[PDB]
Design an enzyme around this catalytic site. Structure first.
Site, PDB file in Angstrom:
ATOM      1  N   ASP A  96       0.389  73.924  63.930  1.00 19.09           N
ATOM      2  CA  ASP A  96       0.213  75.117  63.113  1.00 19.09           C
ATOM      3  C   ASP A  96      -0.968  74.934  62.181  1.00 19.09           C
ATOM      4  O   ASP A  96      -1.116  73.889  61.572  1.00 19.09           O
ATOM      5  CB  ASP A  96       1.468  75.368  62.300  1.00 19.09           C
ATOM      6  CG  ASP A  96       1.455  76.703  61.645  1.00 19.09           C
ATOM      7  OD1 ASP A  96       1.567  77.705  62.375  1.00 19.09           O
ATOM      8  OD2 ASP A  96       1.345  76.756  60.415  1.00 19.09           O
TER       9      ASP A  96
ATOM     10  N   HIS B 109       0.922  78.496  65.628  1.00 18.33           N
ATOM     11  CA  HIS B 109       1.273  79.683  64.849  1.00 18.33           C
ATOM     12  C   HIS B 109       1.816  80.817  65.708  1.00 18.33           C
ATOM     13  O   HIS B 109       2.697  81.565  65.274  1.00 18.33           O
ATOM     14  CB  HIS B 109       0.052  80.170  64.054  1.00 18.33           C
ATOM     15  CG  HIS B 109       0.392  80.802  62.737  1.00 18.33           C
ATOM     16  ND1 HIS B 109       0.959  80.088  61.705  1.00 18.33           N
ATOM     17  CD2 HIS B 109       0.204  82.058  62.267  1.00 18.33           C
ATOM     18  CE1 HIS B 109       1.130  80.883  60.661  1.00 18.33           C
ATOM     19  NE2 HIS B 109       0.677  82.085  60.976  1.00 18.33           N
TER      20      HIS B 109
ATOM     21  N   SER C  74       4.231  82.690  57.413  1.00 19.89           N
ATOM     22  CA  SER C  74       2.798  82.984  57.385  1.00 19.89           C
ATOM     23  C   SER C  74       2.473  83.756  56.091  1.00 19.89           C
ATOM     24  O   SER C  74       2.712  83.239  55.016  1.00 19.89           O
ATOM     25  CB  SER C  74       2.390  83.719  58.675  1.00 19.89           C
ATOM     26  OG  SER C  74       0.993  83.669  58.922  1.00 19.89           O
ATOM     27  N   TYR C  75       1.948  84.977  56.151  1.00 16.43           N
ATOM     28  CA  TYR C  75       1.600  85.692  54.911  1.00 16.43           C
ATOM     29  C   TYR C  75       2.897  85.984  54.127  1.00 16.43           C
ATOM     30  O   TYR C  75       2.886  86.047  52.900  1.00 16.43           O
ATOM     31  CB  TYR C  75       0.864  86.990  55.252  1.00 16.43           C
ATOM     32  CG  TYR C  75       0.041  87.617  54.137  1.00 16.43           C
ATOM     33  CD1 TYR C  75       0.637  88.380  53.137  1.00 16.43           C
ATOM     34  CD2 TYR C  75      -1.338  87.492  54.123  1.00 16.43           C
ATOM     35  CE1 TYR C  75      -0.119  88.986  52.150  1.00 16.43           C
ATOM     36  CE2 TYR C  75      -2.107  88.089  53.133  1.00 16.43           C
ATOM     37  CZ  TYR C  75      -1.493  88.835  52.155  1.00 16.43           C
ATOM     38  OH  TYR C  75      -2.257  89.436  51.175  1.00 16.43           O
TER      39      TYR C  75
ATOM     40  N   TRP D 147      -7.900  87.033  62.246  1.00 16.40           N
ATOM     41  CA  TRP D 147      -6.965  87.684  61.340  1.00 16.40           C
ATOM     42  C   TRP D 147      -7.548  88.968  60.784  1.00 16.40           C
ATOM     43  O   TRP D 147      -6.858  89.971  60.691  1.00 16.40           O
ATOM     44  CB  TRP D 147      -6.587  86.760  60.196  1.00 16.40           C
ATOM     45  CG  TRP D 147      -5.482  87.310  59.351  1.00 16.40           C
ATOM     46  CD1 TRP D 147      -4.178  87.424  59.700  1.00 16.40           C
ATOM     47  CD2 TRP D 147      -5.592  87.838  58.022  1.00 16.40           C
ATOM     48  NE1 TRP D 147      -3.455  87.982  58.671  1.00 16.40           N
ATOM     49  CE2 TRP D 147      -4.297  88.232  57.623  1.00 16.40           C
ATOM     50  CE3 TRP D 147      -6.654  88.006  57.127  1.00 16.40           C
ATOM     51  CZ2 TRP D 147      -4.035  88.791  56.376  1.00 16.40           C
ATOM     52  CZ3 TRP D 147      -6.388  88.565  55.880  1.00 16.40           C
ATOM     53  CH2 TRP D 147      -5.086  88.937  55.513  1.00 16.40           C
TER      54      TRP D 147
ATOM     55  N   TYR E 133       2.266  93.591  57.478  1.00 10.41           N
ATOM     56  CA  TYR E 133       2.266  93.987  58.895  1.00 10.41           C
ATOM     57  C   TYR E 133       3.304  95.066  59.212  1.00 10.41           C
ATOM     58  O   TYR E 133       3.807  95.123  60.340  1.00 10.41           O
ATOM     59  CB  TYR E 133       2.501  92.769  59.786  1.00 10.41           C
ATOM     60  CG  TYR E 133       1.655  91.545  59.449  1.00 10.41           C
ATOM     61  CD1 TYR E 133       0.263  91.569  59.565  1.00 10.41           C
ATOM     62  CD2 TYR E 133       2.252  90.360  59.026  1.00 10.41           C
ATOM     63  CE1 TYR E 133      -0.501  90.450  59.270  1.00 10.41           C
ATOM     64  CE2 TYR E 133       1.497  89.242  58.727  1.00 10.41           C
ATOM     65  CZ  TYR E 133       0.122  89.287  58.849  1.00 10.41           C
ATOM     66  OH  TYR E 133      -0.638  88.175  58.550  1.00 10.41           O
TER      67      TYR E 133
HETATM   68  C1  DBC Z   1       0.077  84.805  58.733  1.00 12.32           C
HETATM   69  O1  DBC Z   1       0.822  86.049  58.710  1.00 12.32           O
HETATM   70  O2  DBC Z   1      -0.902  84.710  59.825  1.00 12.32           O
HETATM   71  C2  DBC Z   1      -2.190  84.475  59.257  1.00 12.32           C
HETATM   72  C3  DBC Z   1      -2.898  83.419  60.101  1.00 12.32           C
HETATM   73  S1  DBC Z   1      -4.617  83.088  59.604  1.00 12.32           S
HETATM   74  C4  DBC Z   1      -1.940  84.085  57.804  1.00 12.32           C
HETATM   75  C5  DBC Z   1      -2.975  84.593  56.802  1.00 12.32           C
HETATM   76  S2  DBC Z   1      -2.672  83.973  55.128  1.00 12.32           S
HETATM   77  O3  DBC Z   1      -0.679  84.649  57.495  1.00 12.32           O
END
Ligand code: DBC
Ligand code: DBC
Ligand code: CL
Ligand code: CL
Ligand code: CL
Ligand code: CL
Ligand code: CL
Ligand code: CL
Ligand code: CL
Ligand code: CL
Ligand code: CL
Ligand code: CL
Ligand code: CL
Ligand code: CL
Lengths: 574, 574
Positions: free
Chosen positions: B258, B286, B116-117, B165, B43
């Site tokens: 989450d 989230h 998250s990612y 996403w 991102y």
């Molecule tokens: C995070 O950055 O937000 C997404 C929510 S589906 C996830 C993708 S692995 O990672």
């Protein structure tokens, strides 16, 4: 190397009195001096993530060759001295700007940016007369601290704002001091209790007795609660009357549900004739920039557009700090999020040229009490002479729901008003269901003919968009405290039973009431804890016990001889 | 100078195939090499404010003498190559860690952190075998991408997560490319339309026909929609089975609302025996870390505690990267936000020792359909053999309200369920009003005896806390897609009319149901668009037109011979 930079922490900058303020310097890799941006912060200069998401991706500025200086205000965190809100910021900004201008890495061009207190401090800097300050960018700010955020144009105390913010600062003051005190843990718990229940904190009487907050931050009583009139103490820290004499470009941001919206917009009007002013207004409240609310979503476009804001700020500073004459090519003067249609729209001025300030008169058969009463709004004057009457009891004020709340449930500006529509002290007036859109974009006010059994009371007015499904969404509102009906400075009481024509400043909005909607106005005498509750005695309100307060029988007069109305800034765009 | 640092932008790091990834280096003023923290971000590494508020005030780490490296993942922003989710991140992390370890400024100790990612990529790094990686801190993440976020333990597609996403990434892919294309403006508008209406986007049939998203990010169909079974394509990117062989300390953060909560918690259980694992779980979704929701406030203590998180992370890295043996003194192994009491509480393990996994059986006189039916929950087995029956029509699925939604209304986890309580396909079972508190903290599951007129269908279960005022607040939920009742890998169809005992994995929660509350369970056959809707045909669901789908008459059996129940992780603390 272009795009690279360094950060120097806790550089100590001496003020005129020898007290040193701490700054952090974000300085580009460059071969000479550079333009500089200053941010003055009472919430820890180290904690950049806390405020920056409500402002700009300002590291872009540093990558692009600006230096950025972030300063701890006097008496907080790494700075020396004693903290008192507002009173030292003109002088400390002047001294800080002077210091920056002396440095080897400053090219003689300085600007500022930032939000809320980081915005107010920019107006305080702008009145310094320091020629090297070339541009400011105050977001969600005010140049008149009485009018926002602490009191308002109606002369009521913004009690939830005061108590919430003082509790937040109290967390900061304790964190800032030398060594951990035995009472800190308990104080931390009590401050959290205020922040979890701001209406509860604001309900204790006398309001002026604040054992915790008055100890941690004496100013809360000594300045704010003790000075209900817009007197010399407030005048001393006001910048507003000096703004007309400035010629400093200002990039001003506001939000329709922001506590500062009326004052933010006024600053634009005050500076636009003498310098390049820009205005951006989104549908935000002070703590909710998302565009999403419990019963109202404005779309992803409404989310605070931080990268577009960053681009605009850089263009603005490129024009005014780097002399790039075409840097603002294609940038509008004014950019508004127009609610209802829920779209951004560019304009050439604020107020909009071709605003038709249009009276909508209060009318109807029978009592307008409650949403199921007979209250109407019409562009035609009412034919019959009527009055709506209610009891305002300070022990049971109308609860605040949305609007420009700051700390008490401050994240739901466009709140559904249905939960208060069955109250007898909420008078409702609405248009018929609309067949064609009506745009209201501008400053909003009411002119009401009122009377009371009391020698002082309040009157409130609130503009509402009634949706097809029944949601009654708040737009803007205001209050007039009757002792201040003619002046915030030299109040006088009213005569019980006498009819007064009073103005209520309802700040501003931008909304298209779409087909199938109604325009609605609620009138009452309280809106708590957005505003403190009038005691209906004529006394010193903040010093009264609840039991000492009186009920008031209040009356709104409407008809040909008493043409009470709301003035709507109508925009017709064909 | 202690506390000072520099930032070098767009340092290009070659991967094993010659493709260079861009990193930014935040390096302390120091006299030798330092410990290093790596963050891998799809991102934009420049955009630190976007994610950091959901993580840590990590500039503190840099001020305290850690270097921080933030990398653009392959094919995005300043990095070279082609972006495809997940598939390159093991190798690219291994190569990046190797490069860091070679640098003059790295002392041989590397860690990672992020959300998250930026969390998933840490598990992908941890399986690299790079000895210099000493600790990770994955927040709101998963080590099994099928199980979270794209499908789930029940074998239904998390369609709103996927489409939301992919639209977000699509904004990033267009922003990332060489030159502005004529179609970009229109694509930007269409992506916004998806993000403004994710349920609408998920409603188009066949689901697999995604003209915009399939063009911008072919993976959305080629990997995700086209592989509904937990097959070799998913296995290739799963890290989970490798976690047991690691001995890497992990500071794991999760949120009760989450999307990743079940998988985040599973990672803790997988690594706790071989290394120092820590767990922090708050009541967050989230995109909403505030502790505030439309009909449920958890208190200011619930707000993501970023400075405490920063302190804990620094202590964790001091222990494992700087060998400071007492750095985690006084830090609990597990720290949970216990809802209901709405307080943080320390624990020694997860699952809690002394969890009593207790069946609460479905019962009641008459039909359990709707909240005004007769459905009961009891720790005693039901005496009579009954069944509740409803029609599940894919054209009218039960709408998702709160829970673990990611992109479609993903900011209201503890949502009031009353808006769906009058639906005939929502079966409700509740306890009597409680006289003493009941704590449920742990993993939650249901065991239901079910039958269908169809050869495939879904069953859902959702745990709910019914408040005294009538709010029916969602806690946790799950789904079982019947073809996957016994395995996510090798599905088989069911026989119409036959009774099956099936398990529903309802993830986890921590809630004290206080006196005056009820424990409630909703059972249905859909929860859209949290999960895609079963077509009730046994076909390839994502390739079916709505008109090709069938209704199903579904039945829940309850009684002595079919003792359907929810298993609650009961904690009794006297
Ligand atoms: C995070 O950055 O937000 C997404 C929510 S589906 C996830 C993708 S692995 O990672
Ligand atoms: C901003 O930082 O938040 C406050 C809301 S009352 C305000 C005080 S001037 O500044
Ligand atoms: Cl001082
Ligand atoms: Cl003191
Ligand atoms: Cl809406
Ligand atoms: Cl727009
Ligand atoms: Cl009378
Ligand atoms: Cl008169
Ligand atoms: Cl590639
Ligand atoms: Cl292409
Ligand atoms: Cl609540
Ligand atoms: Cl707590
Ligand atoms: Cl039957
Ligand atoms: Cl059977």
């Amino acid at each position: 190397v272009d795009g690279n930079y360094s950060v120097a922490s806790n550089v100590m900058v001496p003020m005129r009195d020898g007290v040193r303020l701490a700054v952090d310097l974000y300085r580009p890799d460059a071969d000479g001096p550079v333009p500089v941006l200053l941010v003055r912060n009472p919430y820890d200069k180290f904690d950049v993530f806390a405020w920056s998401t409500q402002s700009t991706n300002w590291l872009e500025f540093v990558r692009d060759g600006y230096a950025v200086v972030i300063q701890d205000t006097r008496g907080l965190f790494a700075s020396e001295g004693e903290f008192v809100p507002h009173v030292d910021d003109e002088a400390d900004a002047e001294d800080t700007l002077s210091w920056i201008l002396e440095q080897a890495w400053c090219d003689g061009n300085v600007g500022m940016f930032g939000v809320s207190y980081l915005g107010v401090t920019q107006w305080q800097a702008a009145v310094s007369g320091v020629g090297g300050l070339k541009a400011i960018a105050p977001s969600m700010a005010s140049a008149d601290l009485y009018r926002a955020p602490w009191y308002g144009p109606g002369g009521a105390l913004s009690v939830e704002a005061l108590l919430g913010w003082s509790a937040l600062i109290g967390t900061g003051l304790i964190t800032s001091r030398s060594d951990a005190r035995p009472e800190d843990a308990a104080d931390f718990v009590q401050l959290a209790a205020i922040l979890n229940d701001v209406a509860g904190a604001a309900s204790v009487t006398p309001l002026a007795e604040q054992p915790l907050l008055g100890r941690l931050i004496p100013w809360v009583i000594d300045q704010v609660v003790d000075h209900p009139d817009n007197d010399e103490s407030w005048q001393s820290i006001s910048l507003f009357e000096r703004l007309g004499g400035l010629a400093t470009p200002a990039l001003i941001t506001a939000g329709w549900y922001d506590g500062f919206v009326g004052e933010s917009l006024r600053t634009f009007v005050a500076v636009k004739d003498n310098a390049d002013a820009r205005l951006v207004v989104g549908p935000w409240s002070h703590s909710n920039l998302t565009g999403r609310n419990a019963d109202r979503k404005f779309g992803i476009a409404a989310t605070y557009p931080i990268q577009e804001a960053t681009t605009m700020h850089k263009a603005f500073f490129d024009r005014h700090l780097r002399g790039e004459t075409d840097a603002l090519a294609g940038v509008p003067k004014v950019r508004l999020f127009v609610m209802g249609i829920d779209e951004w729209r560019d304009e050439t001025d604020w107020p909009l040229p071709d605003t038709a300030y249009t009276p909508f008169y209060l009318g109807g058969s029978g009592a307008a009490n409650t949403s199921t009463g007979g209250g109407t709004l019409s562009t035609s004057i009412s034919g019959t002479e009527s009055a709506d009457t209610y009891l305002y009891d300070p022990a049971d004020p109308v609860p605040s729901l949305g609007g420009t709340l700051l700390f008490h449930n401050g994240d739901n500006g466009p709140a559904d008003q249905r939960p208060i529509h069955d109250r007898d002290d909420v008078l409702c007036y609405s248009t018929e269901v609309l067949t064609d859109p009506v745009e209201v974009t501008g400053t909003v006010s009411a002119r009401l003919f009122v009377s009371s059994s009391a020698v002082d009371t309040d009157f409130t007015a609130k503009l509402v968009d009634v949706f097809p499904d029944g949601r009654a969404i708040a737009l803007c509102d205001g209050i007039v405290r009757m002792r201040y009906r003619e002046t915030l400075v030299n109040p006088t009481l009213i005569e019980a039973g006498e009819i007064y024509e009073v103005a209520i400043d309802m700040l501003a909005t931008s909304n298209v009431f779409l087909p199938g909607h109604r325009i609605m106005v609620q009138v009452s005498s309280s809106n708590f804890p957005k505003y403190d509750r009038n005691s209906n005695t004529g006394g010193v309100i903040a010093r009264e016990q609840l039991e000492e307060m009186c009920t008031a029988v209040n009356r709104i007069h409407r008809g040909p001889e008493h043409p009470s109305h709301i003035v709507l800034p109508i925009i017709k765009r064909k």
